[PDB]
Amino acid sequence: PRLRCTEVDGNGNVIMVDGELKKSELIAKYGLLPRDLRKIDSSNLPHILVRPSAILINLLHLKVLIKHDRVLLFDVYGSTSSYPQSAFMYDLQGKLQQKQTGGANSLPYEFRALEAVLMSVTAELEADFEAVRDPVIRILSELEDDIDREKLRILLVLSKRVSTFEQKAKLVRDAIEELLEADDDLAAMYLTEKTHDLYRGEDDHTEVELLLESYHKLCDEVVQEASNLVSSIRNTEEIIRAILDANRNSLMLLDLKFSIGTLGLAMGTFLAGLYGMNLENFIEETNWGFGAITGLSTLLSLVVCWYGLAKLRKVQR
Template sequence: MVIRMNLNRPMKSFWKTKIRQPSRKSSCQLEQRHVFRLLSQRAFNCKSRSAFQARNANFKGPEKPIESERLLYQGLEISESKQFALGSSLATRLSTDRTLQCTEFDDKGNIVARNVEIKKSDLVNKFGILSRDLRKIDDEHDFPAILVRESTILVNFLQHRALITYKRVLVVHLGTPNTGINYDSSFMYGLQGKLNFGISQHSNLPYEFRALETVLVMVISELDVEYQKIKTPVNKLLDELQHDVSLEKLKQLLDVSKQASAFRQNVQRVRTALHTVLEADDDMAAMYLSGKAAGTPRQEADHTEIELLIENYYDASGEIVDKADKLLSDVEYTYDSVRSILDSHRNSIMMLDVQFSIAAVGLGMATYVVGLYGMNLINGLEENIHGFSFITGGSVIGILGVGIFGLYKLRRVRKIYSMHGMHYDRRHRTKN
């Protein structure tokens, strides 16, 4: 008798049970399960210890957790915060390792470094600021701002970025050396001349105020120049649209009006940044860097010089905002005028169409009557010598009657519509 054994099935089940792929669970779940098991074990140990102490009153067990448990908890805390700490340190390192192209001026207004690459970490250590403060002068940050720190003033206005101390100015260039501000630009010459002039003429303004004033002068000048560049084509288009309205001119007016709106928004941002500083007495007092370096810091209410300086350019920016508003109002008024002209032309075309429709109705009625008598049927007027005159005269009178009646109704409708429009305009003006 031969006994046959099926070896495939046992071996298959064996490989399924013995060589099994491990379950893919996250380390966080495993650590939570391990902590839960440890806490349960500790609770059980505490209950057992309390029961043992109840039976043995003289026994004094350890009040602190054992060393292995403490190390396990410490390792668990490190493992949970490891990813966040690593990510934050990496992000900080990447942000501070970036370089900025800068030009540095000394306390006498001379350029000591031209278009040099400086790491952000070096700027943080050199000027005593935080790494997040450098975001105000990044290429991605387009909002104007004046940031006051203990020994540094960070300035960001349009394309002018600078770090100002009581004895040095670091101008940050935007973009590459070919596209950014170079040291021989008007801004660099103006800054160098202002700093040298203050020393030679013994100006009462501190070094940091003269540097800040140079930045504000350049900003206001550039805004004024940009306003003139926008104003010229806008006024030209407005004059042309008063005589001739075309689609191409309307498209051009739309483009320049968008430019004017963007310009007005930029000027308003500059004005808002200056207003923010004027509203903060502590920031204005902290801007006296030379006094703090000399050991005589200003009180919070003692900031007359810097307040007058910033207020002067705040008013100048306000004038440019008013000019931009007036320019936009002229564009809007022109749009309304063009819209009224187009509406008038459209209404004239519609009235002409209605008049032709009324004339067509009168002619249609006359044609209907003529068609009735034009049929080859006996109607009793064939032998009448006045039949032709009667039918023709009646048709003409019918056409004129329909036309006069239609025009009368049309005029009445126009009168009612115009009275309604005047009443609406008067009510709208009263509400405003």
């Protein structure tokens, strides 16, 4: 029933750092509906909701409520502001307290807040992609030559992480594109003009459209890069899978030569041991039996080995 909240007024000055806010006041004086509170509490789906007097943004690490005179950043009650959140808060305060008075390119409060939010989200996405891209190239280069046991596990660890990052980037891009495809939602975001009884209409929304298209393309570029990386990983895996079976056949063929050699040696040993029996061979007292038998055994071994090698060469041809 409580949330940690940081509040900024219309002058860009922080009046609350890590205060506690009851979700009842959100319905009371912020134009929200009772059914939207459960989206604020716990939701990992990036989205942008346009209300008659407020804008709700849930993008990765940012949960923001933007009005024409106030900005709220909320999160779980028990927590502390992270470094990206502090950097975003500093940038938003600096951009809001500019108090500039330009000409044609002047932007209101809510658009200046949305621009900072989108820039922070895009910067975080780019940083995450740069942090995740580095090990993949190294492990692919290491797997180019040899295939070990632990490198496959490293590739397994990296592939799912890359796929999850690509899915998150696609979700953010689709969340932006969904808002980019509604004319009434684009027209209803002019909160400053609605406070002066001025309504824009569903056909004059150039500024917000131009603001959103740039970040849409920025997210699309990272999505394409992640898709290319995934395709490269898939190709490398599909090639090494066949490389394994290609290099196994070398050992499979090498074993047969040793098998043929053992067969020839056994064939020679059979005839060598035939004459070792305690029987009558009729040539025991001769002076030529030993050399003749040795030569016959050697010739038989050689011819059987040659026949085996010839048959192997014919088969493998």
